Amino acid sequence: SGAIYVGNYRVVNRHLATHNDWANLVWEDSSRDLLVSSTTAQGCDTIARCDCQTGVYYCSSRRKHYPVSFSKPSLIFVEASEYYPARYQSHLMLAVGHSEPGDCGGILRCQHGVVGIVSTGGNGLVGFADVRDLLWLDE
Ligand SMILES: COc1cccc(Cl)c1CC(=O)N1CCC[C@@H](C(N)=O)C1
Numbered sequence: 001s002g003a004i005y006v007g008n009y010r011v012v013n014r015h016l017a018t019h020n021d022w023a024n025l026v027w028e029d030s031s032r033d034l035l036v037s038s039t040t041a042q043g044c045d046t047i048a049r050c051d052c053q054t055g056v057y058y059c060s061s062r063r064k065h066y067p068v069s070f071s072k073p074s075l076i077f078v079e080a081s082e083y084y085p086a087r088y089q090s091h092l093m094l095a096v097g098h099s100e101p102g103d104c105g106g107i108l109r110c111q112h113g114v115v116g117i118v119s120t121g122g123n124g125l126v127g128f129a130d131v132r133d134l135l136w137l138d139e
């Protein structure tokens, strides 16, 4: 679990969005596993606007943060799960690092701010849904 709170927006994994997220929907994209809902309170976070490929993510299944080197956002094949059929997930960044299904939502940060959230993983890999291209999160 986990979310980004920026301005009057909440960014979550689309597969973990609540009934309340859907009732306050701003934007969603199944191909990216992202959903953005509106909030009444002003949010706690800064979005990175950069091309970093190193950063630190929170891993809830270890209660720890780990440093990672990750690929640029790209179209990556993701096997079928209970939430989606087998498909290419777009704007995904992969790194070597521990993850389990419930780690989805953990934030990845660089020195500039929030880069994305855990969205996929397996066998010593962890995949992050990028949010740096969503310029409107800051408007
Ligand atoms: C961090 O996630 C994992 C880590 C290790 C192993 C596994 Cl099977 C997962 C779970 C996983 O990859 N899912 C969860 C559901 C939505 C999926 C998607 N984004 O298409 C991705």
Ligand SMILES: [Zn+2]
Residues within 6 Å of the ligand: 048, 049, 050, 051, 052, 110, 111, 112, 113
């Ligand atoms: Zn950066």
